[PDB]
């Protein structure tokens, strides 16, 4: 083929969390904030060329919640078997000392879609500038997710992408540090 | 001189189901609401030519509620239930049908609000035909 557009949604119990997003060849086009009830575009440039009525997504989610209830019972309450995530920390571009960069924490092939992620600089949590994506769907029906940490390269600092998930025995730390 | 071309219609003896084109499916049958409208009598042939193994169908009380819920509020169907034999109200499928009959014995239709087939004012009215084919 050439291209694929995917409208993907889900609802998870007991969390009572849901999602509604559109995907183009693996990349998110936009998703709907369940709380704010507004559509949020991956790239702000997208909002300048298209639009989506967020209310519609909320309707589907309501129906999905109800359906999840039905499927759970009919399956005789069989729960999802956890699939721990593969985590890898990468840099956005080749690093240069004191040249702003971005640490990408790529969490892949996991389920269910609940994950606690923490960025750590020298063992301490960091929030300054962090950003994340929602859960991206995979052909095998597992999920993919990204977390971002902009930073300034140095020889004095070490980083870690801390990842928690139920299919994991304990928190997983993915280490990164400059190498001179 | 009279040239006589007779035509005997009966139930189909084969399987078929056009999956990219049927109106709806239920239990083992593939249902098709004719797109062209026809006279009640024109239905036997309209259905027999629509698809292979297809024929004018008479809705069983077990089946018309599904047929009936798939009806527009202003749409009606000519159905294969006729006055002649086996209880006097039968079908190419046999059986006996309970019919609302305040009218003329020969044709019947279903509406969104009918629970049994109904005899009609006159069979020349045009309506889509209710056709069927057995799957697998």
């Amino acid at each position: 083929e050439e291209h694929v557009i995917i409208q993907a949604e889900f609802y998870l119990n007991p969390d009572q969390s849901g999602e509604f997003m559109f995907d183009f060849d693996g990349d998110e086009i936009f998703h709907v904030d369940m709380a704010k009830k507004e559509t949020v575009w991956r790239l702000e440039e997208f909002g300048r060329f298209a639009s989506f009525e967020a209310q519609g997504a909320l309707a589907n989610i309501a129906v999905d919640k109800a359906n999840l209830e039905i499927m759970t019972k009919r399956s005789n309450y069989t729960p999802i078997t956890n699939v721990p995530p593969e985590v890898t920390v990468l840099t956005n571009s080749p690093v240069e000392l004191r040249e702003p960069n971005v640490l990408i924490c790529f969490i892949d092939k996991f389920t269910p879609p609940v994950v606690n992620v923490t960025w750590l600089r020298n063992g301490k949590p960091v929030t300054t500038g962090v950003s994340e994506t929602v859960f991206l769907p995979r052909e095998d029906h597992l999920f993919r997710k990204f977390h971002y940490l902009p930073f300034l390269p140095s020889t004095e600092d070490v980083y870690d992408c801390r990842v928690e998930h139920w299919g994991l025995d304990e928190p997983l730390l993915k280490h990164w540090e400059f190498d001179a | 001189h009279t040239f006589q071309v007779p035509q005997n219609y009966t139930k189909a003896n084969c399987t078929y189901c056009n999956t990219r084109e049927y109106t709806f499916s239920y239990k083992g049958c593939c249902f098709y609401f004719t797109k062209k409208k026809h006279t009640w009598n024109g239905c036997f042939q309209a259905c027999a030519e629509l698809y292979p193994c297809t024929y004018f169908y008479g809705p069983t009380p077990d089946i018309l509620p599904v047929v009936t819920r798939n009806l527009n509020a202003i749409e009606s169907l000519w159905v294969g239930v006729y006055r002649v034999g086996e209880g006097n109200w039968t079908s190419l499928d046999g059986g006996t049908f309970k019919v609302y009959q305040i009218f003329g014995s020969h044709c019947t239709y279903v509406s969104k609000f009918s629970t049994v087939p109904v005899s009609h004012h006159e069979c020349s009215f045009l309506k889509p035909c209710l056709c069927v084919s057995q799957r697998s």
Partner: protein, 188 residues
């Protein structure tokens, strides 16, 4: 923690040759098992697993629903393909090509020449290595295409070498964002 129950619904529009061919795939997934699906090429709902049987039967009994999905390839797929074609199918960002060896070693000792290609889009890309004009197909250690999650890709293509003074390695990159192949060299 407690057991989790997951319900997923995916509507996938497959576009081939632009729009000359469009397949619509609607899938219901319980936990990690697809249970029922509508394939525009099939025309009706099909249970994939037994859990989906009830649904496929119920849904194929509704004509309006059947008629809606059978036309979705036009009212939905082809439509949404248009709404965003200008910034998706047409999006193009030129790659940033850099060449550097991994660990600073004296010459003649084995080294890993790195060709970093970053921030590009679409993913379709070609990177080749050259040693004094001749193409090096062997000893190429690559990460493969990496999706950054923000509509940009990157790929690190490393070449195993034992640089001799005078050698000129060239990393050639071809990508739909550039007319003539990009090139960058490294002198030994």
């Amino acid at each position: 923690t407690r057991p989790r129950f997951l319900w997923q619904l995916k509507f996938e529009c497959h576009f081939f040759n632009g729009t000359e061919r469009v397949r619509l795939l609607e899938r219901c997934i319980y936990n990690q098992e697809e249970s029922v699906r509508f394939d525009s090429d099939v025309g009706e709902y099909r249970a994939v697993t037994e859990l989906g049987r009830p649904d496929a039967e119920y849904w194929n009994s509704q004509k309006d629903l059947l008629e809606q999905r059978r036309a979705a390839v036009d009212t939905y797929c082809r439509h949404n393909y248009g709404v965003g074609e200008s910034f998706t199918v047409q999006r193009r960002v030129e790659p940033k090509v850099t060449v550097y060896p991994s660990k600073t070693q004296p010459l003649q000792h084995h080294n890993l020449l790195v060709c970093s290609v970053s921030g590009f889009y679409p993913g379709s890309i070609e990177v080749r290595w050259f040693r004094n004009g001749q193409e090096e197909k062997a000893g190429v250690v690559s990460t493969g295409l990496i999706q950054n999650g923000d509509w940009t890709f990157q790929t690190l293509v490393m070449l195993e070498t034992v640089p001799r003074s005078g050698e000129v390695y060239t990393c050639q990159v071809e990508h739909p964002s550039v007319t003539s192949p990009l090139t960058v060299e490294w002198r030994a």
